[PDB]
């Protein structure tokens, strides 16, 4: 319902609220299915590379999948 109502948001805050809602939906997916969570994580990272929680969660999921074989990514994020 929040995503449906996002169409009525003022354009100034529309980008920020869309990013927030997509992050929340990606969290719900990560609870349900990690693949869609990672997809939305990539979508938001392309949309806003400056956000940290998205990158943290994406790298954390990658480390879970790669058994901590992305130490370079963690160092770069640090």
């Amino acid at each position: 319902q929040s995503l449906e109502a996002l169409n009525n948001v003022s354009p100034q805050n529309k980008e920020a609220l869309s990013i927030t809602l997509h992050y929340n939906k990606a969290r719900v997916e990560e609870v349900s299915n990690q693949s869609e969570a990672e997809k939305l994580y990539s979508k938001l990272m392309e949309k806003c590379p400056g956000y940290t929680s998205n990158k943290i969660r994406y790298i954390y999921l990658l480390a879970l999948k790669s058994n901590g074989n992305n130490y370079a990514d963690v160092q770069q994020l640090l």
């Binding site: 806003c48 400056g50 956000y51």
Partner: peptide
Amino acid sequence: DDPLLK
């Protein structure tokens, strides 16, 4: 520096 991030 991004007003969007702020």
